[PDB]
Amino acid sequence: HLKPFPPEFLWGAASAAYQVEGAWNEDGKGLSVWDVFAKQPGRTFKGTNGDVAVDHYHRYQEDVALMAEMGLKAYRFSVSWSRVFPDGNGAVNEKGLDFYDRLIEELRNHGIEPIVTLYHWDVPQALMDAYGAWESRRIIDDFDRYAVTLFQRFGDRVKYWVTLNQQNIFISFGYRLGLHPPGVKDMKRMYEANHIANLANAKVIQSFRHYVPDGKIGPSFAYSPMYPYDSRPENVLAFENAEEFQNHWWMDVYAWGMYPQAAWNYLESQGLEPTVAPGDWELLQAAKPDFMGVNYYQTTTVEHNPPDGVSSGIPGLFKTVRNPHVDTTNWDWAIDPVGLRIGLRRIANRYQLPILITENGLGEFDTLEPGDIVNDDYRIDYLRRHVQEIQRAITDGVDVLGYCAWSFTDLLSWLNGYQKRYGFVYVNRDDESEKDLRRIKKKSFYWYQRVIETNGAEL
Amino acid sequence: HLKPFPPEFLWGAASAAYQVEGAWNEDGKGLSVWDVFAKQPGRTFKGTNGDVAVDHYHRYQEDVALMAEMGLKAYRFSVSWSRVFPDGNGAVNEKGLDFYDRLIEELRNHGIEPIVTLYHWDVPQALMDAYGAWESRRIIDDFDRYAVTLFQRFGDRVKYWVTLNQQNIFISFGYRLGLHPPGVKDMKRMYEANHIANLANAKVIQSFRHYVPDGKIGPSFAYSPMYPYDSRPENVLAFENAEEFQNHWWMDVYAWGMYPQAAWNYLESQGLEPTVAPGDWELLQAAKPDFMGVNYYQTTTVEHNPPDGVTSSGIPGLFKTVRNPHVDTTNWDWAIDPVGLRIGLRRIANRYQLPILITENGLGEFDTLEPGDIVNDDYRIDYLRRHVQEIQRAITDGVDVLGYCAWSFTDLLSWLNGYQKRYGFVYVNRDDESEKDLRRIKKKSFYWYQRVIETNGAEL
């Protein structure tokens, strides 16, 4: 017998501020690191950027009406720090807070639970300019002051809060790969910034207990569960390495306040472990979250990687390998819904934490057919499979608090423009112009509306 | 570059009381469940039993002098509860205790660390008769009284202690498979006995913190790390279920005081979960060990198993075993997987952050005695070497490995299969038909190990 979805299950959808809002210089908003980075020649496809995006800042009432038509139970969005504190620290911008107050009131007037994400990659450029943003301990108290302001203004109306969204991505892409701001390729700097973001996460959860005593808070991790390629002992060992280095390095700090030892000793052998200060362990261990957020798209399969080896990986630790036993998307991402169940089981088995699935979805090149019809059965199929696996995980005993499909409307991607679309709601624009920004319900919109209405009772 | 073994690494060797001592009815020793069970005709190969075994009770001085010749840093042995409390509870038998005293003094006179194992499967028969031994909560205080006795007598001289050795084996072989005493095949009974053994373990660890404040204690788990067959999602899920059900079901209780929840829910759905009394979780949670003991022989590979499903064993809908084509086998078609030991060590440190004492690892094989008292067992050298090499790699990776006890120091009696499959560094001249002269003969592997210890593992 499958257990049903629980009666207050948060059937959601999600977005991120830079990806949706526009209004990049309006109402006293300050520059974020992404306003500046995306304007560097050549960094984004066809120079696309978040100046306008899908103009949710101006069109939020129409978008919340679509959410109410769908009957969403929750909408997860992120707050743009630069709207609230244009310079990151210093004077609060009341017009910025008032946008989010208006958005929260519009949600709540339609019965939709806001899920507020503190941070989605958009630290104010002034903090970068002053002290290098996440590479300074200065950001711990600046971030905390920003979070506390939000908690004080919104904590009576928002129960569910996400702190750092996909820290592993903004830190790795920003400091190891150089693909995101600040465009650094230096693993030593990566691991120091990562440590400071860990401390900032723990500081804000501690502050949350003072200001939002009935609320629920947690980080959200971009989780690709690792698989060994096969039962070759060296491949299993590669999996142990990979899961610990890629996944436990973040989630064990979130859940337990401790880095895992093998990965720590590997980094220490390379001169890459972060600088620890007095009080750091105590802080990290004291700030227990209410849930683990999970952003999930796919699993990763790994095999042995010798010390002169690579596919991506770490010599002597693991390399990636294509999994012959899963379907692939048109971008060569795995489609692995059973992998979601595995990841959920791993989190519950390791940390005994409830899970909020903060992001999961399918990106594809959607065609707008005559009569403003988008037939995205491929998206319904992906979503369906994943939601069925969630139910299996709940039946196994995992506490899943909700599921936020990525995304509600189509939105701007960070580096690749607009054409690989993720929304329930098509936005008429493309990489060359904003067109009219009209909202058009896709077939998937109506599919999810029926999943919600029936609490997943079948799909 | 590999790290060296730590300077005080406990290079050890091990035995179990029923397997080695003999003296089954001497000095007021009471019957254990194994004394009775092994005398059931048909139960053991050639009717072999522990009445004499390799007669270590009488020959302990000789055996310890061989240990000292080898340079053993530690000797792990078990205490026979029926020697110390012949009826399980009731009067202490001083003559029983004095054997262990004498053994411990022999070891300490030769600079060898005793590692005392409280329990190796030999509960007194009187407790079985009285109240069904491990199926009654009465055993929790009886075992604790016994443990405390030992802690009081030997705590000043024994730093390292193991509680229950291979609980997962005596509980599953005794109550699921019916292979060991009490010969039961009943999963519901298995899980209840298991729960009581968990409580017993936790109670003695609490007692230890009082009596032996500078000592180190832990349970020892017979650990077969699970692997998925391949990267098919369903087979990785089968691995998740198997690791949890076979391994975390014990080690999470030992390390965290908590059963894992998916496995608990599965058992509850089948009416198999144990009875929990008020106080049980608090006791379980408040008895953290200093180390995890590991008995290691091989890994196990699993694959998906239909709800109408399973040579292969498993749980329908959860997992089934499959032969791993990527590991070697012994001449008994069991697996040889040294890297698997490194994996299991990594997993315990990764999950629990515990130091590990490897309490048992070794190779069983027929050995030929050649003229001039020569036994050339290069096969056993190869097997030990490969495992020791992988321990070094685990230590290099950051696992805290306290020591390594090869199984076994002398040849010994197997539970069900007589004497011919030998495990010792020291051959004992006897077989299934005769005690012969019981003489001790150093095998080639003796001298190999001697050299490993002399170089602290630098020369394998």
Coordinates of all heavy atoms in Angstrom, one line a residue, chain B residues 227-283:
Chain B
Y227 N 27.5 -4.0 -1.8 CA 27.7 -3.3 -3.1 C 26.4 -3.5 -4.0 O 25.8 -4.5 -4.0 CB 28.8 -4.0 -3.9 CG 30.2 -4.1 -3.4 CD1 31.1 -4.9 -4.0 CD2 30.6 -3.3 -2.4 CE1 32.4 -4.9 -3.6 CE2 31.9 -3.4 -1.9 CZ 32.9 -4.1 -2.6 OH 34.2 -4.2 -2.3
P228 N 26.1 -2.4 -4.8 CA 25.1 -2.7 -5.9 C 25.8 -3.5 -7.0 O 27.0 -3.2 -7.3 CB 24.8 -1.3 -6.3 CG 26.0 -0.5 -6.1 CD 26.7 -1.1 -4.8
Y229 N 25.0 -4.3 -7.7 CA 25.6 -5.0 -8.8 C 26.1 -4.1 -9.9 O 27.2 -4.3 -10.5 CB 24.5 -6.0 -9.3 CG 25.0 -6.9 -10.5 CD1 25.8 -7.9 -10.3 CD2 24.5 -6.6 -11.8 CE1 26.2 -8.7 -11.4 CE2 25.0 -7.3 -12.9 CZ 25.8 -8.3 -12.6 OH 26.1 -9.1 -13.8
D230 N 25.3 -3.1 -10.2 CA 25.6 -2.1 -11.3 C 24.9 -0.9 -11.0 O 24.3 -0.6 -9.9 CB 25.3 -2.7 -12.7 CG 23.9 -3.0 -12.9 OD1 23.0 -2.5 -12.2 OD2 23.7 -3.8 -13.9
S231 N 25.0 0.1 -11.9 CA 24.4 1.4 -11.9 C 23.0 1.5 -12.3 O 22.5 2.6 -12.4 CB 25.3 2.4 -12.6 OG 25.3 2.1 -14.0
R232 N 22.3 0.4 -12.5 CA 20.8 0.5 -12.7 C 20.2 1.1 -11.4 O 20.5 0.6 -10.3 CB 20.3 -0.9 -13.0 CG 18.8 -0.8 -13.4 CD 18.2 -2.2 -13.6 NE 18.8 -2.9 -14.7 CZ 18.5 -2.8 -16.0 NH1 17.6 -1.9 -16.4 NH2 19.2 -3.5 -16.9
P233 N 19.4 2.1 -11.5 CA 18.8 2.7 -10.3 C 18.2 1.7 -9.4 O 18.4 1.8 -8.1 CB 17.8 3.8 -10.9 CG 18.4 4.1 -12.2 CD 19.0 2.9 -12.7
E234 N 17.5 0.7 -9.9 CA 16.9 -0.3 -9.0 C 17.9 -1.1 -8.2 O 17.5 -1.6 -7.1 CB 16.0 -1.1 -9.9 CG 14.9 -0.3 -10.5 CD 15.2 0.6 -11.8 OE1 16.2 0.6 -12.6 OE2 14.1 1.2 -11.9
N235 N 19.0 -1.3 -8.8 CA 20.1 -2.1 -8.1 C 20.7 -1.2 -7.1 O 21.1 -1.6 -6.0 CB 21.1 -2.6 -9.1 CG 20.5 -3.8 -9.9 OD1 19.5 -4.4 -9.5 ND2 21.2 -4.0 -11.0
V236 N 20.9 0.1 -7.3 CA 21.4 1.0 -6.3 C 20.4 1.1 -5.2 O 20.8 1.1 -4.0 CB 21.8 2.4 -6.9 CG1 22.3 3.3 -5.8 CG2 22.9 2.2 -8.0
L237 N 19.1 1.2 -5.4 CA 18.1 1.2 -4.4 C 18.2 -0.1 -3.6 O 18.1 -0.1 -2.4 CB 16.8 1.4 -5.0 CG 15.6 1.5 -4.0 CD1 15.7 2.6 -3.0 CD2 14.3 1.6 -4.8
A238 N 18.3 -1.3 -4.2 CA 18.5 -2.6 -3.5 C 19.7 -2.5 -2.6 O 19.6 -2.9 -1.4 CB 18.7 -3.7 -4.6
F239 N 20.8 -1.9 -3.0 CA 22.0 -1.6 -2.2 C 21.6 -0.8 -1.0 O 22.0 -1.1 0.2 CB 23.1 -1.0 -3.0 CG 24.1 -0.2 -2.3 CD1 25.0 -0.7 -1.4 CD2 24.0 1.2 -2.3 CE1 25.8 0.1 -0.6 CE2 24.8 2.0 -1.5 CZ 25.8 1.5 -0.7
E240 N 20.9 0.3 -1.2 CA 20.5 1.1 -0.1 C 19.7 0.3 0.9 O 20.0 0.4 2.2 CB 19.6 2.3 -0.5 CG 20.2 3.2 -1.5 CD 21.4 4.0 -1.0 OE1 21.5 4.2 0.3 OE2 22.2 4.3 -1.9
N241 N 18.8 -0.5 0.5 CA 18.0 -1.3 1.4 C 18.9 -2.3 2.1 O 18.7 -2.5 3.3 CB 16.9 -2.0 0.6 CG 15.8 -1.1 0.0 OD1 15.4 -0.1 0.7 ND2 15.3 -1.5 -1.1
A242 N 19.7 -3.0 1.4 CA 20.6 -4.0 2.0 C 21.5 -3.5 3.0 O 21.7 -4.1 4.1 CB 21.3 -4.8 0.9
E243 N 22.2 -2.4 2.7 CA 23.1 -1.8 3.6 C 22.4 -1.5 4.8 O 22.9 -1.7 6.0 CB 23.9 -0.6 3.1 CG 25.1 -0.1 3.9 CD 26.4 -1.0 3.9 OE1 26.4 -2.1 3.4 OE2 27.5 -0.5 4.4
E244 N 21.3 -0.9 4.7 CA 20.5 -0.5 5.9 C 20.0 -1.7 6.7 O 20.2 -1.7 8.0 CB 19.4 0.5 5.5 CG 18.7 1.0 6.7 CD 17.6 1.9 6.4 OE1 17.7 3.1 6.1 OE2 16.5 1.5 6.4
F245 N 19.4 -2.7 6.1 CA 18.9 -3.8 6.7 C 19.8 -4.7 7.4 O 19.6 -5.3 8.4 CB 18.0 -4.5 5.6 CG 17.0 -5.3 6.2 CD1 15.8 -4.9 6.7 CD2 17.3 -6.7 6.3 CE1 14.9 -5.8 7.2 CE2 16.4 -7.6 6.9 CZ 15.2 -7.1 7.4
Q246 N 21.0 -4.9 6.7 CA 22.0 -5.9 7.1 C 23.1 -5.3 8.0 O 23.6 -6.0 8.9 CB 22.7 -6.5 5.9 CG 21.8 -7.3 5.0 CD 21.1 -8.5 5.7 OE1 20.0 -8.4 6.2 NE2 21.8 -9.6 5.8
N247 N 23.4 -4.0 7.8 CA 24.5 -3.4 8.5 C 24.1 -2.2 9.4 O 24.4 -2.3 10.6 CB 25.5 -3.0 7.4 CG 26.1 -4.2 6.7 OD1 26.3 -4.2 5.4 ND2 26.4 -5.2 7.5
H248 N 23.4 -1.2 8.9 CA 23.0 -0.1 9.8 C 22.1 -0.6 10.8 O 22.1 0.0 11.9 CB 22.3 1.0 9.0 CG 23.1 1.6 7.9 ND1 24.4 1.6 7.7 CD2 22.6 2.4 6.9 CE1 24.8 2.2 6.6 NE2 23.7 2.7 6.1
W249 N 21.2 -1.6 10.6 CA 20.3 -2.1 11.7 C 21.1 -2.4 12.9 O 20.5 -2.2 14.0 CB 19.7 -3.4 11.2 CG 18.7 -3.9 12.1 CD1 18.8 -4.9 13.0 CD2 17.4 -3.4 12.4 NE1 17.7 -5.1 13.8 CE2 16.8 -4.1 13.4 CE3 16.6 -2.4 11.7 CZ2 15.5 -3.9 13.9 CZ3 15.4 -2.1 12.3 CH2 14.8 -2.9 13.3
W250 N 22.3 -2.9 12.9 CA 23.2 -3.0 14.1 C 24.0 -1.8 14.3 O 24.1 -1.4 15.5 CB 24.1 -4.3 13.9 CG 23.3 -5.6 14.1 CD1 23.1 -6.2 15.4 CD2 22.5 -6.3 13.2 NE1 22.3 -7.3 15.2 CE2 21.9 -7.4 13.9 CE3 22.2 -6.2 11.9 CZ2 21.0 -8.3 13.3 CZ3 21.4 -7.1 11.2 CH2 20.8 -8.1 12.0
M251 N 24.8 -1.4 13.4 CA 25.8 -0.3 13.7 C 25.2 1.0 14.1 O 25.8 1.7 14.9 CB 26.8 -0.2 12.6 CG 27.8 -1.5 12.6 SD 29.2 -1.2 11.6 CE 28.5 -1.2 10.1
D252 N 24.0 1.3 13.6 CA 23.4 2.6 14.0 C 22.9 2.5 15.4 O 22.9 3.5 16.1 CB 22.2 3.0 13.1 CG 22.5 3.4 11.7 OD1 23.7 3.4 11.3 OD2 21.5 3.8 11.1
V253 N 22.5 1.3 15.9 CA 22.1 1.2 17.3 C 23.4 1.3 18.1 O 23.4 2.0 19.1 CB 21.4 -0.2 17.5 CG1 21.2 -0.4 19.0 CG2 20.1 -0.2 16.8
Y254 N 24.5 0.7 17.7 CA 25.7 0.8 18.5 C 26.2 2.2 18.6 O 26.7 2.6 19.7 CB 26.8 -0.1 17.9 CG 26.5 -1.6 17.9 CD1 27.1 -2.4 17.0 CD2 25.8 -2.2 18.9 CE1 26.9 -3.8 17.0 CE2 25.7 -3.5 19.0 CZ 26.2 -4.3 18.0 OH 26.1 -5.7 18.1
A255 N 26.2 2.9 17.5 CA 26.8 4.3 17.4 C 25.9 5.3 17.9 O 26.3 6.3 18.5 CB 27.2 4.6 16.0
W256 N 24.6 5.3 17.5 CA 23.6 6.4 17.7 C 22.5 6.0 18.6 O 21.6 6.9 19.0 CB 23.1 6.7 16.3 CG 24.0 7.2 15.4 CD1 25.3 7.8 15.6 CD2 23.8 7.3 13.9 NE1 25.8 8.2 14.4 CE2 24.9 8.0 13.3 CE3 22.7 6.9 13.1 CZ2 25.0 8.1 11.9 CZ3 22.8 7.1 11.8 CH2 23.9 7.8 11.2
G257 N 22.3 4.7 18.9 CA 21.2 4.4 19.7 C 19.8 4.3 19.0 O 18.8 4.3 19.7
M258 N 19.8 4.2 17.7 CA 18.6 4.3 17.0 C 18.6 3.3 15.8 O 19.6 3.2 15.1 CB 18.5 5.7 16.3 CG 18.6 6.9 17.3 SD 18.8 8.4 16.3 CE 17.4 8.2 15.2
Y259 N 17.5 2.6 15.6 CA 17.3 1.8 14.5 C 17.0 2.7 13.2 O 16.3 3.7 13.3 CB 16.1 0.8 14.6 CG 16.3 -0.2 15.7 CD1 15.7 -0.1 16.9 CD2 17.1 -1.3 15.5 CE1 15.7 -1.1 17.8 CE2 17.2 -2.3 16.4 CZ 16.5 -2.2 17.6 OH 16.6 -3.3 18.5
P260 N 17.5 2.3 12.0 CA 17.2 3.1 10.8 C 15.7 2.9 10.5 O 15.0 1.9 10.6 CB 18.0 2.4 9.8 CG 18.4 1.1 10.3 CD 18.3 1.1 11.8
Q261 N 15.1 4.0 10.0 CA 13.7 4.1 9.9 C 13.0 3.3 8.8 O 12.0 2.7 8.9 CB 13.3 5.6 9.8 CG 11.7 5.8 9.9 CD 11.3 5.7 11.3 OE1 11.9 6.3 12.2 NE2 10.3 4.9 11.6
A262 N 13.6 3.2 7.6 CA 13.0 2.5 6.5 C 12.9 1.0 6.9 O 11.9 0.3 6.6 CB 13.7 2.7 5.1
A263 N 14.0 0.5 7.4 CA 14.0 -0.9 7.8 C 13.0 -1.1 9.0 O 12.3 -2.1 9.0 CB 15.4 -1.3 8.3
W264 N 12.9 -0.3 9.9 CA 12.0 -0.3 11.0 C 10.6 -0.4 10.5 O 9.8 -1.2 10.9 CB 12.1 0.8 12.0 CG 11.1 0.8 13.1 CD1 9.8 1.2 13.1 CD2 11.3 0.2 14.4 NE1 9.2 0.9 14.3 CE2 10.0 0.3 15.1 CE3 12.4 -0.5 15.0 CZ2 9.9 -0.1 16.4 CZ3 12.2 -0.9 16.3 CH2 10.9 -0.8 16.9
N265 N 10.3 0.5 9.5 CA 8.9 0.5 9.0 C 8.6 -0.7 8.2 O 7.5 -1.2 8.3 CB 8.7 1.8 8.1 CG 8.6 3.0 8.9 OD1 8.6 4.1 8.2 ND2 8.7 3.1 10.1
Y266 N 9.5 -1.3 7.5 CA 9.3 -2.5 6.8 C 9.0 -3.6 7.8 O 8.1 -4.4 7.6 CB 10.5 -3.0 6.0 CG 10.4 -4.4 5.5 CD1 9.5 -4.7 4.4 CD2 10.9 -5.4 6.1 CE1 9.3 -6.0 4.0 CE2 10.8 -6.7 5.7 CZ 10.0 -7.0 4.6 OH 9.8 -8.3 4.2
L267 N 9.8 -3.7 8.9 CA 9.5 -4.8 9.9 C 8.2 -4.6 10.5 O 7.5 -5.6 10.7 CB 10.7 -4.8 10.9 CG 12.0 -5.3 10.3 CD1 13.2 -5.1 11.2 CD2 12.0 -6.7 9.8
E268 N 7.8 -3.4 10.8 CA 6.6 -3.1 11.5 C 5.5 -3.5 10.6 O 4.4 -4.1 11.0 CB 6.5 -1.5 11.7 CG 5.2 -1.1 12.4 CD 5.3 0.4 12.7 OE1 6.0 1.1 12.0 OE2 4.5 0.8 13.6
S269 N 5.6 -3.3 9.3 CA 4.5 -3.7 8.3 C 4.3 -5.2 8.3 O 3.3 -5.8 7.8 CB 5.0 -3.3 6.8 OG 5.8 -4.1 6.1
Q270 N 5.4 -6.0 8.7 CA 5.4 -7.5 8.7 C 5.1 -8.0 10.1 O 5.1 -9.2 10.3 CB 6.7 -8.1 8.2 CG 7.2 -7.7 6.9 CD 6.2 -8.0 5.8 OE1 5.6 -7.1 5.2 NE2 6.0 -9.3 5.6
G271 N 4.9 -7.1 11.0 CA 4.7 -7.5 12.5 C 5.9 -8.0 13.2 O 5.8 -8.8 14.1
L272 N 7.1 -7.6 12.7 CA 8.4 -8.1 13.1 C 9.2 -7.2 14.0 O 10.2 -7.6 14.5 CB 9.2 -8.5 12.0 CG 8.7 -9.6 11.1 CD1 9.5 -9.9 9.9 CD2 8.6 -10.9 11.9
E273 N 8.8 -5.9 14.2 CA 9.6 -5.0 14.9 C 9.6 -5.4 16.4 O 8.6 -6.0 16.9 CB 9.1 -3.6 14.7 CG 8.0 -3.1 15.6 CD 6.7 -3.7 15.3 OE1 6.4 -4.5 14.5 OE2 5.8 -3.3 16.2
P274 N 10.7 -5.2 17.0 CA 10.7 -5.6 18.5 C 9.8 -4.8 19.4 O 9.4 -3.7 19.1 CB 12.2 -5.3 18.9 CG 12.6 -4.3 18.0 CD 12.0 -4.6 16.6
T275 N 9.5 -5.4 20.6 CA 8.8 -4.7 21.6 C 9.7 -3.7 22.3 O 10.8 -4.1 22.9 CB 8.3 -5.7 22.6 OG1 7.5 -6.7 21.9 CG2 7.5 -5.1 23.7
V276 N 9.3 -2.5 22.5 CA 10.1 -1.4 23.1 C 9.4 -1.0 24.3 O 8.2 -0.9 24.4 CB 10.2 -0.2 22.1 CG1 10.9 1.0 22.7 CG2 10.8 -0.7 20.8
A277 N 10.2 -1.0 25.4 CA 9.7 -0.6 26.7 C 10.1 0.8 27.0 O 11.1 1.3 26.4 CB 10.3 -1.5 27.7
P278 N 9.4 1.5 27.9 CA 9.9 2.8 28.3 C 11.3 2.7 28.9 O 11.6 1.7 29.6 CB 8.9 3.1 29.5 CG 7.7 2.4 29.1 CD 8.1 1.1 28.4
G279 N 12.1 3.6 28.5 CA 13.5 3.7 29.0 C 14.5 3.1 27.9 O 15.7 3.3 28.1
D280 N 14.0 2.3 27.0 CA 14.9 1.6 26.1 C 15.6 2.6 25.2 O 16.8 2.5 25.0 CB 14.1 0.6 25.1 CG 13.6 -0.7 25.7 OD1 13.9 -0.9 27.0 OD2 13.0 -1.4 25.0
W281 N 15.0 3.6 24.6 CA 15.7 4.5 23.7 C 16.8 5.3 24.5 O 17.9 5.5 24.0 CB 14.8 5.4 22.9 CG 13.8 4.8 22.1 CD1 12.4 5.1 22.1 CD2 13.9 3.7 21.2 NE1 11.8 4.3 21.1 CE2 12.7 3.4 20.6 CE3 15.0 2.9 20.8 CZ2 12.5 2.4 19.7 CZ3 14.8 1.9 19.9 CH2 13.6 1.6 19.4
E282 N 16.4 5.8 25.7 CA 17.4 6.5 26.4 C 18.6 5.7 26.8 O 19.7 6.3 26.8 CB 16.6 7.0 27.8 CG 15.3 7.8 27.5 CD 14.0 7.2 26.8 OE1 13.6 5.9 26.6 OE2 13.3 8.1 26.3
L283 N 18.4 4.4 27.1 CA 19.5 3.6 27.4 C 20.4 3.4 26.2 O 21.6 3.6 26.2 CB 19.1 2.3 28.0 CG 20.1 1.2 28.1 CD1 21.3 1.6 28.9 CD2 19.6 -0.2 28.6

